[PDB]
Write an enzyme that holds these catalytic residues in place. Structure first.
Site, PDB file in Angstrom:
ATOM      1  N   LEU E  41       0.843  -1.184   0.000  1.00 35.34           N
ATOM      2  CA  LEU E  41       0.000   0.000   0.000  1.00 35.34           C
ATOM      3  C   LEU E  41       0.882   1.240   0.000  1.00 35.34           C
ATOM      4  CD1 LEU E  41      -1.620   0.848   3.436  1.00 35.34           C
ATOM      5  CD2 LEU E  41       0.212  -0.796   3.262  1.00 35.34           C
ATOM      6  N   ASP E  42       0.347   2.324  -0.547  1.00 36.20           N
ATOM      7  CA  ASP E  42       1.154   3.497  -0.831  1.00 36.20           C
ATOM      8  C   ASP E  42       1.361   4.334   0.426  1.00 36.20           C
ATOM      9  OD1 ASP E  42       1.189   2.641  -3.453  1.00 36.20           O
ATOM     10  OD2 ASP E  42      -0.538   3.869  -4.027  1.00 36.20           O
TER      11      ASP E  42
END
Ligand SMILES: CCCCCCCCCCCCCCCCCC(=O)OC[C@H](COP(=O)([O-])OCC(O)COP(=O)([O-])OC[C@@H](COC(=O)CCCCCCCCCCCCCCCCC)OC(=O)CCCCCCCCCCCCCCCCC)OC(=O)CCCCCCCCCCCCCCCCC
Ligand SMILES: CCCCCCCCCCCCCCCCCC(=O)OC[C@H](COP(=O)([O-])OCC(O)COP(=O)([O-])OC[C@@H](COC(=O)CCCCCCCCCCCCCCCCC)OC(=O)CCCCCCCCCCCCCCCCC)OC(=O)CCCCCCCCCCCCCCCCC
Ligand SMILES: CCCCCCCCCCCCCCCCCC(=O)OC[C@H](COP(=O)([O-])OCC[N+](C)(C)C)OC(=O)CCCCCCCCCCCCCCCCC
Ligand SMILES: CCCCCCCCCCCCCCCCCC(=O)OC[C@H](COP(=O)([O-])OCC[N+](C)(C)C)OC(=O)CCCCCCCCCCCCCCCCC
Ligand SMILES: CCCCCCCCCCCCCCCCCC(=O)OC[C@H](COP(=O)(O)OCCN)OC(=O)CCCCCCCCCCCCCCCCC
Lengths: 171, 128, 606, 176, 87, 60, 459
Positions: E41-42
């Site tokens: 996930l960013d």
């Protein structure tokens, strides 16, 4: 004690409350309990202490003075005349301050006794208060801190000479 | 949609909108790196003088002593009386003094003239 | 009279024994909170009795003894009295502070410095009691500065926390401006009436009453947190919670206007005085009412609310109705002590997050404190027969039926609408909405002292307003003859305010995200007065302290003018005189020209 | 003005902007559901032009974003009651009495607490024994004449404690 | 205030409120896992994670730290350091 | 010898002593003199404390 | 008064032929016995003063100041160890004997019948203080401080002697009674104006007023605690005592010529209260506080109201006690940390739990707490100056606001909020320092119960 004619008191006026209805009266029971719990024992203690006082007898007298003559009868320098003169004047100054204190306490007591109507039966004491304090404002006021007695007599001469010129103009 | 945020001497310019932070020279990178080097060396010397178990007294901060002797004793040198210094000295030293002196002369002359006429409220003014 | 004077003096003297308990302690107690609570309870139960005798008979009195420095034509003793105000106020304050002793047993249980706290708070009660019993004006001044400095200490209780001692410094600064106003009034009373004694001052009526009443206005607007000197009140809220409860519900904030309630026979006259009174009251009322909107802390909302209530009391002194203002003091005291104590219960129950954002769901989270808040924020407005009806609505009736300033009426009207709407918003965001507060919750009221204190003050704020406000001798003329829409207008304005606040609440239910339009800012940033003045006047005075005073006038110029010029003159004259090389021809030529200059130029043989 | 680096990063500056704007939108926007809507709108507004390959266009959008943020901030943001400016913010700084003290007691009070003072004595012996050679050699061995950073190295040589640990380990409990 | 806290409670609660999040899965979620490296996930959502822990436990952690947490073990360790979770 | 014999005995010594600067004597003498001057008609504190019989103004 | 002069002499060879580590106990015990015997003086009644010779006599202005001197001696003689306890036996005995000799000349000065004798014992008080502050100043500008002290106080004080000789040989003797009982008004000539300016300007130097006040703060921040407390309390209040006595002559011309000194005193009181709000160097705040309060005293003396003189002597005695105590707390904190600064020594609420009470109580006696004597003095000065003019009360209350501000800032700066956690040398408070604090505070509160003593001649 005290004289009743220097610290005057009007006669007492006290009603008899007629209770309309019957709850009755918590403060009457409470003041009877107050009498029985406070009034008797402190009276017995004071009576014991007064018997212990009146076993012996002390006395204190009031200090009194004479009239050393004047400052108006003292000469140019004559330090053993001016000394008695100015100490006699300074004792007059102290007792006259306490005259003002007595009159102002009378004014306070007339305020608090007469209640929410101030101007009934306080006109006479306010009148004599303004009278004596007008005398004080005329006599001792505007001389300052290094009063000895001589500035007061200089103010005396200057004021009566100014009023002499005023009544000469009024003639 | 912006009123451009004019600054003042009391509303400080915040670190977000400089906007000189967003066009960057390499010399500013060098300056930030050397400033980090200075603070790192100062914290290293402080922490080595800070955690000695043998040390008892205070750490003797030289910047505080330097600021104190700069603020108390080293004001009088250096000094030369300039036109600005003399003007501001005679303004802040004598001006308000002579102003309050004028107003006390005015009030006392009015009060003594008024009681020479006698029309004051000294019907009883005892505690003088 | 034996019972009356003796019981007033023992109500004063019971608040000296726990100070003897801590001074002669030497073996540290544990039940010292219990001791202070039961002696305050005994002080109240002996303060109920002479007030009952006062209503039953009348019989006011003064006592005055132990005169010290009876120097000139004046004399001053420890002189205190009980009249209508002076003993109708004391049981209310003792009752409120006994409930705060309960709540401060609870709230401050987990801090091990509780003994010094109750020492300070008892001493504060002693000083405010000395303020509300005295008639000698110097003794009023003693009580004044004593409650000022105990307010300093109790605001700065939590050392650390630079906000707290900043707050305490602001509070003591505005109290010294109250001091300059009060000593100006004291100076005028001394020089023009030979005393500072309320009996003699009321005995006369001096007609040139401009300078003393201006000094009284300055002292009241300093002590009573009003416009020009108001913004120390939320800052004063930044201390502990029972501190703020006692300090700004009953005591320490009414002592500004209690002086003006005392001086009613001197402010009978002077229409200029009453005009200043009610103009200042209306200004405070609208200003802190509009400033109370969009505030997102609890205690700052309650501080702006009590500032608006003191604004109504200054309006109540502007109209010639002092006794209604005193009735409002009593009911207001019960009411906001109860409100502060309930909010302190919630704040300690919810891990001290203390803010209106992240506060929401508390109804049915045990609803005893929600019952307390709805009874309270109901009673703040005019609710037709509750405690808040009597005082506030007789105030607005007597304000409307008088020769008033015609704009102050509108200010009090609009600010009654504003106190309706922030009362509604504090209810809605504190009790009603969806629960916004973090998990692992331990909301707890299974607790004896908390429910006893809240119970005692709700029983207070339901009945004691009527019980106090009915059996008093009528010291004024009640108006009682109003038209339509002048008696109805209180309920009309509070109902339209409720409709306005409920539709603002239902617009808060929407989702639009409108940008602010700077009236939001003007009402949200505490007004621009605290930021502007607290960044200007600390900067201006200290900028002129460094340049003019510190470096410029004393050190650099005075050390150049007196030491330096003299020392440099002596240095240069010495370096001209003693700098002589030793040739004898110069010395004898000096002798020769001395002989010639003494013979022929400046004669010495003539 | 940070210990480890000199400048933050570009990404770090955008990231601090995102956290500050999201926190101010929390404080602006009560009821938490319209908050969640507006927060996902903000997350989408960052997503729409996140993948621009320039750099001067990145700092352009960043600068105008700070302008249109500082236009729309909130006056009293909901800061937590431990942050600076908060409600508490060292509330309990009243009771953080440091542990260079507690050795200046009378020995009767030291006779009231035997075990804690004995274990403080062994911790103080552990401080004094392992101070000079290990810590000062690791602090005067690895750095250059300019340290150029403030991260200090762990003790991984053979044995004992990391350097400069005493006034970081023996700090008060922060809820005493 | 009287809360009890331990390492077990903070570990289970942090792993709980990371398990509840949408675009990761409770199938492959150990205590020891990175965010960008393996969960994927960013970093924007990583700061949303940090915002979730701040809004839950009730105290700010600074961005001088919030650069470099990246894994729930160090999250549990850092908040246990800040609250001093021992007796 | 700084508290037990100095401070407390000094408190008892200057707590009460002869009437300092003649205060209570002035009280009692003023009580007697106001009683006299009210019982004998004349106003209390007549002004002109030096008798104008014993004064000689310079003429004009 | 000879019964107070001669045991002060006899207490001096006590210090010499007492043995090692026994000079201390004997001097402290015997000076406290002298303090009790001094408190037995208070006999003064009503009409006259009391005459303890044609050489000695006591006004009621001189009685509380004399008891203040003989009470401040043992307090100081205990206050002045731990910064000379490591020094030599001979230098220690010399210091203690120097303080005893300074007490002797102060008693000489306060019971001075003649103004010539008053001037001689005035500068005899001036002599040992230079030796004390120069030999034990413990800083590097103690030479500068003692030298400015010397030349300021002489060069102001010196034509006062010429004016006193002129009064001596134009009006006979200079007993205060025969200077009194004979004093004639002196009209608005110019020689009378210069005689007034000489006498009043000498004491203006001694108080000080604003244009001559940098005399003081170097002589307090660069001096030991004994010289500091005696210097401040007894020397400034002795200067005020002297002005009170000599202002009985020159009655008419003070109204003509006494306006600019009132002015410089008021505006410099405001500027001095402003300058002691922002400084460092904790010792100096009390010095400029003393300058502010004695400017208030000067306004009180030059206006000539009995309310003003009562408030003046009350303010003198209360501020002497408060400023001496606050100097002593400043030296206690300086012995804790060798700083002299203010922003360094922070914390001290957590540590040293009892010292907060003495800091707070001394700061409130400096705050003009209302039952205390300080507010009694300031209040009567405000009453008298509002009788002087209806407009000058703004400056008095502005002084009041700024005085409360800097005093309470001095409280909450050093002793409020966070220890700097790199100090780690401060020990818990000794019994000696708290004994000194209790010897300062408790007479002030017991005079606050009964202040009929300290009000002066015009009671
Ligand atoms: C006869 C004369 C001597 C009498 C001595 C009696 C015994 C003194 C004693 O043992 O006191 C215990 C007490 C010590 O208490 P503790 O149990 O050791 O712990 C308290 C802490 O040290 C922390 O100290 P603290 O919090 O007690 O100090 C706070 C400080 C705060 O100061 C004030 O509150 C002063 C302002 C009062 C209002 C003014 C209007 O002082 C007071 O609270 C004093 C209250 C009375 C003031 C008015 C007299 O002593 C003091 O605080 C020192 C003396 C204080 C002044 C007493 C004045 C009496 C007259
Ligand atoms: C009959 C005997 C006749 C011959 C006597 C010897 C004359 C030769 C001599 O001394 O030459 C050295 C020297 C002149 O040589 P220079 O190198 O041209 O002087 C320039 C220097 O830079 C020094 O001057 P500057 O420009 O740097 O600043 C000097 C200025 C400093 O001025 C200020 O600080 C401005 C404020 C002054 C006070 C203003 C308000 C006063 C109220 O004025 C003074 O210090 C005047 C001192 C005397 C008056 C004291 C007041 O003389 C002086 O500096 C004068 C000293 C005083 C001598 C007379 C003392 C009488 C008592
Ligand atoms: C100044 C120079 C330094 C002096 C150092 C020693 C100072 C000692 C001062 C002690 C003052 C004591 C005053 C006092 O207690 O008065 C009795 C005070 C005040 O009383 P009073 O002095 O007003 O009068 C009482 C008079 N008799 C005893 C006859 C009724 O009494 C109390 O406070 C009652 C307890
Ligand atoms: C400052 C110097 C003060 C000198 C002493 C005061 C004095 O008398 O000065 C007047 C003296 C001169 O005055 P004098 O003292 O000669 O006074 C003479 C008085 N009649 C005229 C009545 C005889 O002037 C100076 O000292 C100038 C400086
Ligand atoms: C109204 C009241 C006015 C009161 C004025 C009092 C006199 C002025 C101040 C006197 C003290 C001056 C002083 O101390 O100056 C310092 C200076 C010595 O300092 P420095 O430059 O360091 O000298 C080298 C030493 N190693 O010392 C000197 O240079 C001394 C110079 C002589 C000063 C004598 C005192 C004045 C006499 C005036 C006579 C006319």
């Amino acid at each position: 004690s005290w004289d009743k004619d220097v610290y005057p008191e009007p006669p007492r006026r006290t009603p008899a409350p007629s209770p309309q209805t019957s709850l009755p009266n918590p403060i009457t029971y409470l003041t009877k309990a107050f009498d029985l719990l406070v009034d008797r024992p402190v009276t017995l203690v004071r009576e014991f202490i007064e018997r212990q006082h009146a076993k012996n007898k002390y006395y204190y007298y009031h200090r009194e003075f004479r009239r050393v003559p004047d400052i108006t009868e003292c000469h140019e320098k004559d330090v053993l005349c001016m000394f008695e003169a100015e100490m006699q004047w300074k004792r007059d100054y102290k007792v006259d301050q306490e005259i003002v204190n007595i009159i102002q306490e009378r004014l306070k007591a007339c305020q608090q006794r007469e209640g929410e109507s101030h101007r009934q039966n306080c006109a006479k004491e306010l009148q004599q208060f303004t009278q004596v304090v007008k005398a004080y404002q005329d006599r001792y006021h505007d001389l300052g801190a290094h009063y000895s007695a001589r500035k007061c007599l200089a103010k005396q001469k200057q004021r009566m000479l100014a009023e002499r010129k005023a009544t000469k103009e009024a003639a | 949609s912006f009123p451009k945020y004019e600054p003042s001497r009391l509303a400080s310019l915040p670190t977000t909108l400089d906007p000189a932070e967003y066009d960057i020279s390499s010399e500013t990178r060098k300056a930030q790196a050397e400033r980090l080097a200075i603070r790192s060396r100062l914290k290293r010397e402080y922490q080595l003088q800070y955690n000695d178990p043998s040390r008892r007294g205070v750490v003797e901060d030289p910047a505080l002593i330097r600021w104190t002797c700069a603020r108390s004793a080293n004001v009088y040198p250096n000094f030369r009386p300039n036109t600005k210094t003399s003007l501001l000295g005679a303004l802040f030293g004598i001006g308000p003094l002579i102003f309050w002196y004028y107003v006390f002369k005015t009030d006392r002359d009015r009060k003594e003239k008024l009681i020479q006429e006698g029309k004051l409220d000294r019907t009883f003014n005892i505690s003088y | 009279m034996n019972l009356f004077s003796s019981l007033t003096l023992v109500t004063l003297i019971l608040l000296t024994m726990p100070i003897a308990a801590i001074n002669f302690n030497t073996h540290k107690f544990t039940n010292y909170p219990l001791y202070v609570k039961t002696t305050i309870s005994c002080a109240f139960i002996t303060s109920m009795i002479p007030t009952m005798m006062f209503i039953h008979t009348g019989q006011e009195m003064i006592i005055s003894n132990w005169h010290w420095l009876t120097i000139q034509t004046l004399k001053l003793s420890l002189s205190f009295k009980m009249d209508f105000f002076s003993m109708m106020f004391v049981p209310v304050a003792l009752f409120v502070t006994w409930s705060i002793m309960e709540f401060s047993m609870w709230y401050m249980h987990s801090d091990p410095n509780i003994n010094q706290f109750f020492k300070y708070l008892l001493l504060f009660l002693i000083t405010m009691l000395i303020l509300v019993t005295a008639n000698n004006l110097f003794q009023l001044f003693i009580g004044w500065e004593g409650v000022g400095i105990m307010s300093f200490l109790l605001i700065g209780w939590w050392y650390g926390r630079t906000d707290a001692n900043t707050a305490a410094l602001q509070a003591i600064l505005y109290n010294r401006i109250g001091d300059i106003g009060f000593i100006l009034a004291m100076a005028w009373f001394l020089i023009n009436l030979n005393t500072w004694d309320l009996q003699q001052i009321f005995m006369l009526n001096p007609n040139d009453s401009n300078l003393p009443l201006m000094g009284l206005i300055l002292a009241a607007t300093g002590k009573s947190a009003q416009f020009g000197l108001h913004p120390w009140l939320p800052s004063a809220m930044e201390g502990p919670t029972p501190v703020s409860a006692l300090l700004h519900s009953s005591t320490m904030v009414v002592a500004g206007i209690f002086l003006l309630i005392r001086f009613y026979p001197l402010t009978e006259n002077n229409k200029f005085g009453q005009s200043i009174m009610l103009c200042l009251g209306a200004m405070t009322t609208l200003f802190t009412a509009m400033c109370a909107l969009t505030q997102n802390d609890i205690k700052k909302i309650i501080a702006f609310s009590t500032s608006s209530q003191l604004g109504l009391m200054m309006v109540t002194i502007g109209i010639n109705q002092p006794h209604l203002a005193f009735l409002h003091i009593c009911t207001h005291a019960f009411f906001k002590a109860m409100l502060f104590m309930c909010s302190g219960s919630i704040i300690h129950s919810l891990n001290d997050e203390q803010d209106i954002r992240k506060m929401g769901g508390l109804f049915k989270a045990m609803p005893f404190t929600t019952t307390a808040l709805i009874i309270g924020s109901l009673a703040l407005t005019g609710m037709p027969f509750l405690t808040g009806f009597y005082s506030k609505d007789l105030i607005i009736e007597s304000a409307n039926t008088s020769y008033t300033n015609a704009w102050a009426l509108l200010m009090t009207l609009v600010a009654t609408s504003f106190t309706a709407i922030y009362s509604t918003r504090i209810i809605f965001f504190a009790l009603l909405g969806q629960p916004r507060f973090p998990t692992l919750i331990n909301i707890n009221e299974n607790n004896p002292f908390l429910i006893n204190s809240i119970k005692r003050l709700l029983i207070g704020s339901l009945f004691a307003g009527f019980i106090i406000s009915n059996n008093i001798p009528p010291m004024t003329i009640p108006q009682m003859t109003m038209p339509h829409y002048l008696k109805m207008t209180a309920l009309t304005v509070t109902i339209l305010g409720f409709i306005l606040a409920l539709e603002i609440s239902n617009t808060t239910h929407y989702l639009k995200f409108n940008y602010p339009s700077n009236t939001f800012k003007f009402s949200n940033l505490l007004g621009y007065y605290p930021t502007i003045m607290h960044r200007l006047t600390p900067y201006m005075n200290l900028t002129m302290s460094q340049k003019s005073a510190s470096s410029l006038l004393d050190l650099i110029w005075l050390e150049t003018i007196l030491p330096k010029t003299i020392s440099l003159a002596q240095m240069k004259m010495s370096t001209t005189i003693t700098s002589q090389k030793g040739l004898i021809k110069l010395y004898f030529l000096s002798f020769l020209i001395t002989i010639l200059i003494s013979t022929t130029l400046l004669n010495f043989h003539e | 003005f940070l210990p480890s680096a000199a400048y933050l990063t570009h990404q770090q500056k955008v990231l601090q902007l995102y956290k500050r704007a999201l926190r101010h939108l929390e404080s602006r926007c009560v009821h938490r559901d319209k908050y969640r809507y507006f927060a996902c709108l903000l997350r989408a507004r960052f997503d729409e032009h996140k993948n621009e390959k320039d750099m001067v266009k990145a700092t352009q959008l960043l600068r105008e974003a700070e302008k249109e943020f500082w236009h729309g901030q909130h006056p009293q943001p909901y800061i937590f009651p431990e942050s600076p400016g908060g409600t508490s913010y060292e509330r309990y700084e009243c009771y953080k009495v440091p542990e260079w003290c507690l050795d200046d007691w009378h020995p009767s009070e030291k006779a009231m607490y035997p075990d804690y003072f004995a274990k403080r004595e062994q911790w103080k012996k552990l401080r004094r024994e392992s101070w000079e050679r290990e810590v000062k050699q690791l602090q005067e061995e690895t750095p250059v004449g300019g340290p150029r950073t403030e991260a200090l190295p762990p003790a991984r040589k053979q044995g004992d404690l990391p350097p400069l640990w005493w006034h970081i380990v023996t700090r008060p409990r922060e809820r005493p | 205030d009287a809360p009890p806290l331990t390492l077990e409670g903070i570990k289970d609660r942090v792993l709980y409120v990371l398990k509840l999040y949408d675009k990761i899965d409770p199938e492959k979620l150990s205590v020891n896992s990175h965010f960008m490296k393996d969960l994927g996930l960013d970093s924007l959502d990583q700061v949303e994670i940090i915002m979730a822990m701040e809004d839950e436990f009730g105290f700010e952690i600074p961005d001088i730290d919030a650069e470099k947490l990246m894994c729930p073990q160090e999250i549990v360790d850092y908040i246990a350091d800040k609250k001093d979770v021992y007796e | 010898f700084g508290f037990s014999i100095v401070l407390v005995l000094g408190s008892t010594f200057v707590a009460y002593l002869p009437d300092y600067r003649m205060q209570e004597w002035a009280r009692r003498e003023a009580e007697r003199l106001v009683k006299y001057r009210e019982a004998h008609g004349l106003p209390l504190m007549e002004s002109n404390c030096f008798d104008p019989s014993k004064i000689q103004l310079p003429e004009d | 008064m000879l019964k107070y002069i001669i045991p002060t002499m006899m207490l001096m060879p006590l210090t010499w032929l007492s043995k090692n580590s026994m000079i201390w106990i004997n001097t402290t015990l015997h000076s406290l016995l002298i303090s009790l015997t001094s408190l037995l003086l208070l006999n003064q009644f009503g009409d006259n003063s009391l005459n303890f010779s044609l050489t000695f006599f006591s006004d009621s202005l001189s009685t509380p100041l004399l008891i203040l001197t003989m009470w401040l001696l043992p307090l100081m003689l205990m206050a002045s160890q731990h910064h000379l306890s490591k020094e030599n036996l001979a230098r220690k005995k010399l210091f203690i004997s120097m303080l005893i000799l300074l007490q002797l000349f102060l008693i000489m000065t306060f019971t001075a019948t003649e103004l010539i004798f008053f001037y001689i014992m005035f500068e005899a008080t001036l002599v040992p203080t230079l030796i004390i502050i120069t030999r034990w100043g413990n800083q590097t500008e103690r030479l500068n401080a003692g030298l400015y002290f010397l030349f300021y106080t002489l060069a102001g004080s010196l034509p006062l002697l010429v004016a006193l000789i002129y009064i001596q040989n134009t009006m006979g003797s200079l007993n205060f009674l025969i200077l009194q009982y004979w004093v004639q008004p002196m009209p608005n000539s110019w020689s009378n104006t210069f005689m007034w300016l000489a006498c009043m300007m000498a004491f203006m130097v001694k108080m000080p007023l604003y244009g001559l006040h940098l005399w003081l703060p170097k002589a307090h921040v660069e001096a030991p605690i004994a010289g500091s407390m005696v210097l401040a309390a007894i020397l400034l209040k002795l200067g005020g005592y002297g002005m009170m006595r000599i202002t009985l002559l020159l009655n008419p011309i003070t109204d003509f010529m006494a306006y600019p000194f009132i002015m410089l005193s008021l505006w410099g009181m405001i500027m001095t209260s402003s300058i002691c709000l922002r400084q460092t160097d904790l010792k100096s705040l009390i010095a400029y506080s003393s300058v502010s309060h004695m400017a208030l005293v000067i306004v009180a003396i030059l206006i000539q109201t009995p309310w003003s003189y009562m408030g003046a002597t009350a303010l003198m005695i209360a501020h002497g006690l408060t400023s001496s105590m606050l100097f002593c707390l400043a030296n206690s904190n300086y012995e804790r940390v060798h700083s002299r600064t203010m922003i360094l020594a922070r914390g001290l609420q957590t540590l040293l739990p009892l010292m907060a009470a003495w800091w707070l109580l001394a700061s409130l006696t400096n705050l003009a707490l209302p039952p205390s004597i300080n507010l009694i003095g300031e209040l009567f000065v405000v009453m008298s100056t509002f009788s002087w003019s209806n407009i000058t009360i703004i400056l008095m209350g502005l002084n009041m606001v700024i005085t409360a501000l800097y005093s309470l800032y001095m409280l909450i700066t050093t002793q409020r909020g966070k220890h700097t956690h790199h100090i780690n040398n401060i020990l818990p408070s000794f019994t000696r320092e708290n004994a000194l604090m209790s010897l300062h505070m408790l007479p002030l509160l017991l005079l606050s119960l009964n202040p009929k003593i300290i009000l002066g001649p015009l009671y």
